[PDB]
């Protein structure tokens, strides 16, 4: 029930595109 794929949210939510949830 961790939910978080560690590597701290992929890599910190910026590798893809702002986490797609942070984007800009």
Swiss-Prot record:
One Gene Ontology term, aspect cellular component: extracellular region
Biological process terms in GO annotation: defense response to bacterium
KW Transmembrane helix (keyword) present: no
Main subcellular localisation: secreted
Keywords in alphabetical order: Antibiotic, Antimicrobial, Secreted, Signal
Localization per record: Secreted
Job of this protein: Antimicrobial peptide.
Family according to the record: Belongs to the pleurocidin family.
Protein name: Pleurocidin-like peptide WF3
Organism: Pseudopleuronectes americanus
Part of the intact protein present: 23 to 46 of 61
């Amino acid at each position: 029930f961790l939910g978080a794929l560690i590597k701290g949210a992929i890599h910190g939510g910026r590798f893809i595109h702002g986490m797609i949830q942070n984007h800009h």
